[PDB]
């Protein structure tokens, strides 16, 4: 063991962050392509980089989901605050949702196309949510670039997801004040 | 252990070009802890980029650092009279400790100027020692690699003999280059013709000046 | 705005202050006392991430026990309360360094210095990480050095003061 | 003061033998740097040789110098120690102290750096040189002086006592496999001017006590 | 929030810490290096003009060093960073002032105490304005006697520790 | 952010700073004189309720003096100058303590230790309250213990500093 | 030279704020109509106070520019700031724009009419961002007039405009704070 001035030993420890599971979102990184953002032990939201889309139409039809009002409302929330966070956001037509049933389905269509890019601000903002692991995510002034054609938000099951990064609450309780910031006016 | 390879191990470039120095680590090192230095002869290493990118105070703005994950580079963008010596990167934190590169040298690219070669026989003071040196010498030559084949009865020579090349010369940017084929007494007067053959890519074909003893 | 969360952990202690993370709070390792000197740092500084976490895991332990479970996790109290507890802008440093590649805190693993014999310990700093990759003890060594002199400052203006 | 670091030590020894490097700082606050050790083999590059934290409390080596080198600090003397035991001959080099600061708050570097301390470590005995010309054999002639079997170095070779320096080139040293130094000194003349001039090459060893000046003549 | 930007500079200088506000940073000056014990103020005080402007002008050299330059202006990074250099109440303090006729701080303008022997230099103050005219000196020339007071009595502490 | 609005009440003092109360600020009281010593750490400390009030009621006495009165009432002024004055943060932990059943301060009702020949005053510290019922003195009769010993201690730092 | 105590010699320093052109707006004055703030070297933004309009129309198709998305990105974050740092603003008639091809046209009629004039709104949000030398602008509870008709901001050129007071980023850091403050649901 390391010994500084001879009596004072270098000691380590690390949080348990599941700890907080019940009281804030905790983020993790399953692998490159698959990350996630639990709330508690029953539910929780998946956040995929992938070719693969699963809505080919342009509809988010918020409006008919909060009336009908069948959603997880801490889900919603943190939709919420991911899309609100996404610095210059001007392609409406790039976020497609799906509300059926209450389930939350939001797809991101990065392939709109450096730092004018729609996909430069959502990656912004799943860098930053999902903070612990998204370095193994992707690879100029913050802008960043990727090869993956679409960000995927669904809600999951509480599953050990947490199979790359420990969860931390961390990428969460940071972006809550980029909400309403770097919005246009429209 | 971790390896810093630069490169080029030797850059030649003319007085007010880009001079562009490379550094590759064995594995992916934090660009933090990544230094660059400047070594002249005639003094100690001389800190010029530090953290990846910061340039150390002193240092006039020409230098520039950038690199991230396993490459890092060291630009210097109009080279001045005093820019050409050595360059070393160096990484703290893995093992070594302090690592460092094997160095880049930017020398004072010339017109090729061919060596002017000569021959020395022995002395006969050392003669009378019992040990025979003779001496080929370029002289004034680019670039600075050239080839010396020591030759003695028409047969080639390995192992008895020490190259020594002059630093670039301050005015003309040329080098100097001295072969001394040491021998035995005994082995000298073995055989008769003694000659050094000189291959640079400034003469036409290659030069071989001789001597027969006496 | 600036954060306000106090740490309530004084009972059956030799002396008010100081916080106690329980196993719960621990990865794989066993409970961990700092003393109230160090814990005290804590209402004052504006950049000690391991404070920032120390009431962020107080006021998940009070909120749990003082308010009853909801049917369907709400992250509505958090959303109230996280800048009571955290400085949003220490970890937007943190943010901006990561961004710039300089080592930064990814707020989960923290180093102290523990006397051999008296057991006295320092506010745990954060170990900083760049690129998936942990800093070595030998790159913030001297950080580590000038910690045990506060130590020893430190125990020093204790025995002038125990008199 | 200026901020720098000044070096004392050195020398030659014998293989096993001992040597003592010191590096004494001056206007800056010496007990809040790392302290370091590098040298320079000849004809190879920057290599470290170990360190020290600020506080003394670290140590680290390379490990070619492992268990024979000891490096060591007095922050109340300002001063930093390199205590080589058991030297080898490839432990010959210049050796250099500096400066560092290793906290998160700055990165990695080497700033302030001690001159240079020459360590020799070799069986040979210091020796003199021994002189033997280099005679010449239309257009440009070139005579010159071999400075063969000398230790150690340095040796200053001037021509005809200062007065002849344009195209003179004395070479740089070669280590024989003796363990003795051999130079050559050449300068190259006017062929015309062969008869007419006398040609000196003026060999000083400081180190030996030695001052040799020898004719060079054709033929 | 609570800034949290810190300040590096300490490379060739004779002991770590202060900052040396180089040529370009200065309008029609030469560089100014203040030391450590004057900067240092600036990780804790939170009404120091000066010190936010450090905190920006760092920023902005760390930025410019550290990212590379996009084809267009972005400024998506200062407005993520703002409140990580700068105390947006300071300013808001300033502009309530204005709004209220009282001398305010528009940035710009500094003084600062500067010893005739040793060169040490006290932390600068924001030069007051007020409708476009700046405060005369005498206007504040009690403000200026406890800063060389403050001067003195650190150059007397430097002394007792320096045994 | 941070708060920043500083008071000014030096006029006609024994020596500068402190604030008073006017009778106009007081519920049936008189007024109410504050010393440098007490005030003088509401520029430092980030969670004393009554130095955030302290500023409020200063803001209000110098925005009614110094700027002309609107025809039809305005809060456009408080809703910008807000974070300047209070700690929305400390507000913050008193709302969540009161949804946590803990006593907590609703910025009414102060307490304060004055000597009973120099007159020397405490900085007034919050008068707790839950669920309308007011904290008796005995709940918090070790607070007032210790507040006595920095007072005493404070006067001992006095008689030092007076040679 | 000014001594105090003897010994300690009174000197100043001024920024030049013209270093932080690459990563933060510069507002500056160029006369008592003309203000300007600049991002970079090569765009900015001139706001004007005038009486003569630009535009005789009553739309702000933002919308529209969104979709198209032809405009410079950071002056349409600027021109957003700016709009939701205006309190209590209500008078959507009293602002009309222009974005075809991708210009900054905006122009606030402030002769829509003490307090609650929409001129009071924009004139206090004209003060934040030219904090530097708007004071030459116009001459109450913070409450403003003025005898100009429109408030009019229009992308510029890089030019030496700064020509009465030189260039500061505080006027634009300070107003961010205010964006989403005092402003009205709908
Ligand atoms: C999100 O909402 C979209 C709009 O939703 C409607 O309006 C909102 C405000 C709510 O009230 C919501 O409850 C409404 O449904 C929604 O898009 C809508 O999708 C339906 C299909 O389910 C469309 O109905 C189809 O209409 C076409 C004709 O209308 C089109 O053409 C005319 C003329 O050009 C236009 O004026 C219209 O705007 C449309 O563009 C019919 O031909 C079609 O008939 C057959 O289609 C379905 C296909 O399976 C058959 O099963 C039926 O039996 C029919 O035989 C439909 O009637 C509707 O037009 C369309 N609206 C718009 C504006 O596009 C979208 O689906 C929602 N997304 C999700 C994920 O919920
Ligand atoms: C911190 O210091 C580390 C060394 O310090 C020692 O260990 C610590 C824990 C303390 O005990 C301290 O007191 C000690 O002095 C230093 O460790 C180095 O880490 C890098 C990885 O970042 C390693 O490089 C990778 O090595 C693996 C393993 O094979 C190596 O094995 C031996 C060591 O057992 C080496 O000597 C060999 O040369 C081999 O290289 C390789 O698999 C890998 O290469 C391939 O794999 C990666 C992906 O896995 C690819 O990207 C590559 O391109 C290759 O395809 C790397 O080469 C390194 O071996 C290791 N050294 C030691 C001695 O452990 C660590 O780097 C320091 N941290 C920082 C941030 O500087
Ligand atoms: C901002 O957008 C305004 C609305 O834009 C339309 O809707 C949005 C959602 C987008 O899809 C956008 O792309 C659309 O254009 C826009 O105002 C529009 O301006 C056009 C003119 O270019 C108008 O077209 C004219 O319509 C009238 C008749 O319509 C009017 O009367 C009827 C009946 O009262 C109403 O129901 C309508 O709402 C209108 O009030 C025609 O008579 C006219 O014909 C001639 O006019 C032009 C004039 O130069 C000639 O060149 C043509 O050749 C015609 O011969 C036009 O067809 C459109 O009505 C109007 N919409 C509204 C709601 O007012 C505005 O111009 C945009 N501003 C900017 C700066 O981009
Ligand atoms: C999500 O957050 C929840 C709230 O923080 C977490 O709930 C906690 O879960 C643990 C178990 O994982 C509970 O532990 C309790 O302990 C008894 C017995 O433990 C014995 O051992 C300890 C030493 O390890 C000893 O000190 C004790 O005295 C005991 O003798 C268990 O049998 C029970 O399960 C019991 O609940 C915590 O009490 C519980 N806290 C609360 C407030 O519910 C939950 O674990 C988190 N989820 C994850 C995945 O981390
Ligand atoms: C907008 O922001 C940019 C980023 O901050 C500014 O860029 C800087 O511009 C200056 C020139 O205006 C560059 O200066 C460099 O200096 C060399 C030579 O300078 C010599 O003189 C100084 C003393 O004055 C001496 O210390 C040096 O060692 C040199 O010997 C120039 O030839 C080059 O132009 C060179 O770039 C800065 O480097 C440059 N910084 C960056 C990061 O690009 C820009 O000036 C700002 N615009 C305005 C209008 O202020
Ligand atoms: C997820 O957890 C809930 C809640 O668990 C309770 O609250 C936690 C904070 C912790 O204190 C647990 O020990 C508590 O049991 C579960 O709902 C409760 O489940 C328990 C049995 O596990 C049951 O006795 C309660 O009646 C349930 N309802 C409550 C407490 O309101 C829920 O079952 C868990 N879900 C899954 C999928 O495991
Ligand atoms: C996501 O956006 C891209 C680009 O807008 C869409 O790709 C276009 O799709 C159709 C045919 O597939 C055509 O408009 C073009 O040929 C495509 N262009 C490119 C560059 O791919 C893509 O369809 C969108 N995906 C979804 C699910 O809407
Ligand atoms: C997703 O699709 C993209 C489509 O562009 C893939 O990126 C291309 O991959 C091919 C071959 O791998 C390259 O030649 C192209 O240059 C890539 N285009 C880029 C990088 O813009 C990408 O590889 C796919 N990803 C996965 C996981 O299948
Ligand atoms: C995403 O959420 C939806 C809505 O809650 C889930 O679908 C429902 O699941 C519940 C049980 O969890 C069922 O009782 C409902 O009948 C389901 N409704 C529908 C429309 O499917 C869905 O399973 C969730 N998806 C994942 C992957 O967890
Ligand atoms: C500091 O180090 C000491 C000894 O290494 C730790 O003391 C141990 O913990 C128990 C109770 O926590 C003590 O009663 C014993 O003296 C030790 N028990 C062992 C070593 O089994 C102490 O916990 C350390 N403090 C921290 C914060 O890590
Ligand atoms: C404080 O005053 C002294 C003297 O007026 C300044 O020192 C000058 O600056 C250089 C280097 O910056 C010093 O080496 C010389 O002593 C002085 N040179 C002159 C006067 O030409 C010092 O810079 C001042 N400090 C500040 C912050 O202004
Ligand atoms: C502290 O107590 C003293 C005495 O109880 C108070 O002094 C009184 O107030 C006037 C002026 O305010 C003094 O001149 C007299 O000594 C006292 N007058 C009385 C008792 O009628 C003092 O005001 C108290 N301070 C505070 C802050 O309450
Ligand atoms: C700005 O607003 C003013 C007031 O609403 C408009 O002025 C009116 O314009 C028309 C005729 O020009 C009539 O409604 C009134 O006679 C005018 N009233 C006043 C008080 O001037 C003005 O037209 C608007 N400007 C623009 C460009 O829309
Ligand atoms: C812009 O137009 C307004 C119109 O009101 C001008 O203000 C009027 O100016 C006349 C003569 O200068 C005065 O008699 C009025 O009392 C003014 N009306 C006011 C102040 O409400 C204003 O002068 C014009 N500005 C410019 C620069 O031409
Ligand atoms: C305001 O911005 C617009 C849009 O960029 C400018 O107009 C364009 O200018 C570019 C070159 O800068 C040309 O290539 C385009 O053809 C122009 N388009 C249009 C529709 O004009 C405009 O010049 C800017 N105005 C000012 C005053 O700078
Ligand atoms: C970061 O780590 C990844 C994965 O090991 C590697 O590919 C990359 O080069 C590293 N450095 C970066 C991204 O700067």
């Known amino acids: 063991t390391s010994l500084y001035k001879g009596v004072y030993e270098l000691q380590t420890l690390e949080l348990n962050m599941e700890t907080l599971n019940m009281t804030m979102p905790l983020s993790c990184t399953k692998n490159n392509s698959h990350h996630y953002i639990m709330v508690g032990n029953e539910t929780g939201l998946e956040l995929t980089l992938t070719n693969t889309s699963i809505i080919n139409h342009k509809f988010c039809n918020l409006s008919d989901a909060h009336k009908k009002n069948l959603y997880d409302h801490a889900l919603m929330s943190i939709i919420s605050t991911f899309h609100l966070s996404i610095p210059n956001f001007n392609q409406y037509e790039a976020m497609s949702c799906d509300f059926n049933g209450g389930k939350i389905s939001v797809q991101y269509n990065l392939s709109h196309s450096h730092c004018g890019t729609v996909a430069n601000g959502v990656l912004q903002t799943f860098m930053r949510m999902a903070w612990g692991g998204s370095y193994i995510a992707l690879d100029n002034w913050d802008c960043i670039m990727t090869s993956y054609q679409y960000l995927i938000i669904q809600n999951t099951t509480w599953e050990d997801h947490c199979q790359f990064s420990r969860p931390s609450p961390i990428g969460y309780l940071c972006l809550l004040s980029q909400r309403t910031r770097d919005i246009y006016i429209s | 252990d971790i390896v810093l390879t630069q490169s080029p191990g030797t850059l030649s470039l003319s007085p007010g070009e880009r001079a562009t120095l490379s550094c590759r680590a064995s594995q992916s090192v934090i660009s933090y802890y990544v230094a660059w230095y400047q070594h002249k002869g005639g003094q100690a290493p001389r800190l010029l980029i530090y953290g990846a990118s910061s340039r150390a105070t002193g240092v006039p703005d020409r230098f520039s650092g950038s690199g991230s994950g396993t490459d890092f580079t060291l630009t210097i963008s109009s080279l001045e009279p005093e820019d050409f010596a050595l360059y070393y990167c160096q990484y703290y934190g893995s093992s070594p400790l302090w690592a460092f590169g094997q160095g880049t040298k930017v020398e004072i690219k010339r017109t090729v100027a061919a060596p002017s070669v000569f021959i020395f026989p022995p002395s006969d003071e050392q003669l009378k020692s019992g040990t025979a040196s003779v001496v080929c010498l370029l002289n004034n030559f680019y670039p600075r690699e050239a080839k010396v084949q020591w030759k003695v009865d028409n047969a080639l020579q390995s192992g008895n003999s020490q190259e020594s090349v002059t630093e670039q010369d301050s005015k003309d940017s040329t080098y100097s280059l001295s072969s001394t084929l040491t021998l035995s007494k005994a082995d000298y007067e073995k055989h008769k013709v003694y000659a050094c053959e000189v291959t640079h890519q400034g003469l036409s074909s290659p030069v071989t000046k001789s001597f027969n003893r006496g | 705005?600036?954060?306000?969360?106090?740490?309530?952990?004084?009972?059956?202690?030799?002396?008010?202050?100081?916080?106690?993370?329980?196993?719960?709070?621990?990865?794989?390792?066993?409970?961990?006392?700092?003393?109230?000197?160090?814990?005290?740092?804590?209402?004052?500084?504006?950049?000690?991430?391991?404070?920032?976490?120390?009431?962020?895991?107080?006021?998940?332990?009070?909120?749990?026990?003082?308010?009853?479970?909801?049917?369907?996790?709400?992250?509505?109290?958090?959303?109230?309360?996280?800048?009571?507890?955290?400085?949003?802008?220490?970890?937007?440093?943190?943010?901006?360094?990561?961004?710039?590649?300089?080592?930064?805190?990814?707020?989960?693993?923290?180093?102290?210095?523990?006397?051999?014999?008296?057991?006295?310990?320092?506010?745990?700093?954060?170990?900083?990480?760049?690129?998936?990759?942990?800093?070595?003890?030998?790159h913030f060594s001297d950080d580590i050095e000038q910690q045990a002199d506060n130590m020893i400052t430190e125990m020093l203006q204790k025995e002038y003061m125990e008199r | 003061?200026?901020?720098?670091?000044?070096?004392?030590?050195?020398?030659?020894?014998?293989?096993?033998?001992?040597?003592?490097?010191?590096?004494?700082?001056?206007?800056?606050?010496?007990?809040?740097?790392?302290?370091?050790?590098?040298?320079?083999?000849?004809?190879?590059?920057?290599?470290?040789?170990?360190?020290?934290?600020?506080?003394?409390?670290?140590?680290?080596?390379?490990?070619?110098?492992?268990?024979?080198?000891?490096?060591?600090?007095?922050?109340?003397?300002?001063?930093?120690?390199?205590?080589?035991?058991?030297?080898?001959?490839?432990?010959?080099?210049?050796?250099?102290?500096?400066?560092?600061?290793?906290?998160?708050?700055?990165?990695?570097?080497?700033?302030?750096?001690?001159?240079?301390?020459?360590?020799?470590?070799?069986?040979?005995?210091?020796?003199?040189?021994?002189?033997?010309?280099?005679?010449?054999?239309?257009?440009?002639?070139?005579?010159?002086?071999?400075?063969?079997?000398?230790?150690?170095?340095?040796?200053?070779?001037?021509?005809?006592?200062?007065?002849?320096?344009?195209?003179?080139?004395?070479?740089?040293?070669?280590?024989?496999?003796?363990?003795?130094?051999?130079?050559?000194?050449?300068?190259?003349?006017?062929?015309?001017?062969?008869?007419?001039?006398?040609?000196?090459?003026?060999?000083?060893?400081?180190?030996?006590?030695?001052?040799?000046?020898?004719?060079?003549?054709?033929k």
Chains 1, 7 share one sequence.
Not at chain 4, 67 to 88: H, I, P
């Open chain 4, 1 to 218: 003061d200026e901020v720098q670091l000044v070096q004392s030590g050195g020398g030659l020894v014998r293989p096993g033998g001992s040597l003592r490097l010191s590096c004494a700082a001056a206007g800056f606050t010496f007990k809040s740097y790392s302290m370091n050790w590098v040298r320079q083999a000849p004809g190879r590059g920057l290599e470290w040789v170990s360190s020290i934290t600020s506080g003394g409390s670290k140590t680290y080596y390379a490990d070619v110098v492992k268990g024979r080198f000891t490096v060591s600090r007095d922050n109340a003397k300002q001063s930093l120690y390199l205590q080589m035991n058991s030297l080898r001959a490839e432990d010959t080099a210049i050796y250099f102290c500096a400066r560092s600061l290793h906290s998160t708050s700055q990165p990695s570097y080497m700033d302030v750096w001690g001159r240079k301390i020459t360590v020799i470590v070799s069986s040979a005995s210091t020796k003199g040189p021994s002189v033997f010309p280099l005679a010449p054999s239309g257009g440009t002639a070139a005579l010159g002086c071999l400075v063969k079997d000398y230790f150690p170095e340095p040796v200053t070779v001037s021509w005809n006592s200062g007065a002849l320096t344009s195209g003179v080139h004395t070479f740089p040293a070669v280590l024989q496999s003796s363990g003795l130094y051999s130079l050559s000194s050449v300068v190259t003349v006017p062929s015309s001017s062969l008869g007419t001039q006398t040609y000196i090459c003026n060999v000083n060893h400081k180190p030996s006590n030695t001052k040799v000046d020898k004719r060079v003549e054709p």
């Open chain 3, 1 to 138: 705005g600036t954060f306000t969360w106090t740490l309530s952990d004084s009972e059956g202690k030799d002396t008010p202050g100081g916080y106690c993370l329980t196993r719960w709070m621990l990865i794989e390792a066993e409970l961990k006392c700092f003393g109230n000197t160090a814990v005290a740092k804590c209402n004052e500084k504006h950049d000690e991430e391991f404070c920032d976490m120390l009431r962020l895991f107080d006021f998940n332990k009070q909120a749990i026990q003082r308010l009853k479970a909801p049917a369907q996790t709400s992250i509505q109290l958090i959303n109230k309360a996280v800048n009571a507890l955290i400085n949003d802008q220490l970890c937007m440093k943190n943010h901006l360094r990561d961004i710039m590649g300089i080592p930064y805190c990814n707020y989960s693993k923290y180093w102290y210095l523990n006397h051999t014999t008296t057991g006295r310990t320092s506010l745990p700093k954060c170990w900083l990480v760049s690129n998936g990759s942990y800093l070595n003890e030998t």
